[PDB]
Symmetry: D2
Subunit: 254 residues, 4 copies
């Protein structure tokens, strides 16, 4: 339980990685969605302690019950520190999140999948909560449209908003900013009139990666509920075998 002097050094994170467990989450309409999560749970290990208890992190996942409300997630972080007899720990869980969506012209309903990561960290007595969402959208190239007699190259794009939250934000709030700022958002089901609509909206609203990151960042900068964010936009170029990438990091405290 105690370290040799050559091993007398603290470990910032020690725990389980990639544990797959089912979870239930709460929508902005208060409804519960069943999803599967990949969990990472770790604690700080004091220089003197030889090792953590790995079994306890799995035990905590089995014990937990109910929707993963922002309140339960904070409770889980505190439960882990008590179960593991630790003073500092991180819990991270990623899962696919589905929003029912209405086609722009037809009104036909379809689910779209977003990748959501929720991270809680307790270090220096300070509890920090982060919500990260990957939103798939459509991007059209302004240069292609300007220099071409007809057509404009467009590609699927991923906008990743990772935000430290001062207060509760629904993920739908983060998804909405990316979808509104995108040349055009994505629907799973589109009838012919909808395809006409999204083809035309994207062309009318071309955006480089730089344009998209700046437009999304300005909206994030205005939401007080967000204290700090890392914003990434990746355009999977249709005319190339690589991607165009823009990153903006903001810490309002600083």
């Amino acid at each position: 339980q105690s370290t040799v002097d050559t091993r007398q050094m603290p470990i910032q994170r020690v725990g389980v990685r990639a544990v797959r467990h089912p979870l239930t989450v709460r929508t902005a309409e208060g409804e519960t969605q069943a999803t599967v999560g990949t969990w990472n749970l770790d604690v700080h290990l004091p220089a003197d302690q030889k090792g953590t208890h790995m079994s306890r992190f799995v035990a905590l996942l089995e014990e937990r019950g109910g929707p993963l409300t922002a309140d339960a997630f904070r409770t889980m972080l505190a439960t882990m520190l008590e179960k593991l007899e630790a003073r500092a720990g991180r819990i991270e869980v990623s899962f696919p999140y589905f929003v029912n969506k209405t086609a722009p012209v037809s009104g036909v309903r379809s689910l779209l999948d977003y990748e959501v990561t929720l991270t809680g960290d307790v270090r220096d007595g300070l509890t920090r909560v982060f919500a990260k969402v990957l939103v798939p959208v459509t991007s059209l190239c302004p240069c292609s449209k300007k220099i071409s007699q007809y057509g404009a190259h467009n590609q699927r794009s991923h906008v990743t908003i990772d935000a430290e939250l001062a207060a509760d934000v629904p993920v739908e709030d983060l998804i909405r900013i990316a979808e509104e700022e995108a040349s055009c958002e994505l629907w799973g089901l589109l009838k012919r009139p909808d395809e006409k609509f999204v083809t035309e909206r994207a062309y009318e609203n071309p955006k480089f990666v730089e344009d998209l990151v700046r437009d999304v960042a300005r909206r994030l900068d205005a939401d007080e509920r967000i204290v700090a964010y890392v914003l990434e936009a990746e355009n999977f170029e249709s005319i190339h075998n690589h991607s165009a990438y823009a990153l903006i990091e903001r810490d309002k405290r600083r």
Copy 2:
């Protein structure tokens, strides 16, 4: 070596998987191209033989020298069967492959990467060789262009040609067929005149995934060198979070 009756059954494939190993390949331009390969080497195991020798498959990779050519690959398949004391075996290697390309208007030269898989199988008295290439290309939707006042949804597409070879075929020949049948091919480096060119040609040549596979299949059908093939085209839809997909399978001997 020796099996119990309960374990007295032949194993069609036994050996090593995912062995990463450097390899040099003689190109159509006669350059020796150095690339990294993931190797799968396996042999049929007779009911009475309890196990193959795993170390020998790795030893063959270390022993082998010089550029990989169609003749060298066949020689390796025979060498392995002799080394492993086996009558039937399969060798599969997948590696990134690069072709220097010339931009359509400016003529600027850039590398484009393809995924090549070379597979040799000896079984039932027959030696079969297969060349599989994943070709990245551009696809433009004919419906989007027809129904829209402006624009046409376009996206990166992968054309996978998996061909059993009656006669040796350079990978470049398979890549060329896919690139020619695509709405537009892909270049790593495009100048603004090139960007204008590829935007326009894609628009002038819209193809559905069904149109793309059918056009590639017709070229494969006309090729005396290819006895049989499994052809796949996937369109990574810009307007959707999923892909459009088509597969044509054909055996000339049928």
Copy 3:
């Protein structure tokens, strides 16, 4: 809607790939488990038809309701052929599947995740249903144990049973054969006495990949409910950076 003569050729499969949709499944205890699936839905396209309707495949997923019982899956395949106006189609869905498990000595309960793929194909008037499960287990090397004064090298292994089913088989039935034939099965939560138990059981039951595939195959050969299977075992070697792979394919009809 009709093909040019150069494009007058049938396409075996045309449809959507990698569509992520939530689904509910039924356990062998008849209970319902909520899981997320990646769906692939395609139909055969007659030479004359220019193209399928891609929107309909997504519409079918949105329309479907209730647990995905083996009876619903057959109904869905028929519904798709009618919705898409086709005569032949394939529906494939993969999802993580969780079984609550009891530790061997402590009796502590933990969930384990398996990858389950369910595939339905309707071609030549014939309906075929396939259930594929990836089961994670533990493998110990017989050679290492025999030649070493102490210790024996052991690694996580994946056993993949893909089976065409004459009649309904619960996935738990397929998982059980792999877990019983493995040097030792896997538990998410293990107390110290359980770790002693699984350390010792694995050592007492060493199995090469060949031994494991043959032991599992014999059990599959005995289950009439299975008409044909592809069995794969991969050992992720702890002493190497590659894997040991064994494959057995059986078609009882043949």
Copy 4:
């Protein structure tokens, strides 16, 4: 070039991502090793500049020639900033790296593959260079061995050393530190005497993930060349479907 006030904000990172390109690296043994790299090239964008030139980043890759050495990598970072007309930028390349290795007893020679990431960042008037290597090793559980009558659960482990360099360090030096501190290192080709050797040494040298990271950290702390580092060790538990994980982060300037 020119921004609106709403888009008047700096972008910390803008450029190309996931560009695949061949590269040659001079090895510690002075051999020129040809490998395939995935490149990420980005530059800081000033608030007033509306966009970077994407084509130039690809042009630099095509233009660059000769083996990648520490000096050459620094020269490329400067070349890119001049080519892109930028004052701050990052270049990151990841490639498979092979070291010929000698078996512990038989002395047979086999290649072992590592994942190398070289990152150069110029920002805030400071140029920072980092070498990151993923080293595959073997880990044996000390608890399994102590509590069991026979055997000890062991598994492949990845040790990732991400080091900021005060002075140039060959990747081989980082790999050696991880291999020496591991229960046992990995060889591609092992003869039966070698198998006996590595089985026994691992058993005689059991390490927990906390023990492994602490031992590697002590070597890194003693190294004058490394100013700072993020050290990760992941044990892909044979007895579990998840991984044990530990991370130590250290900045000497702190």
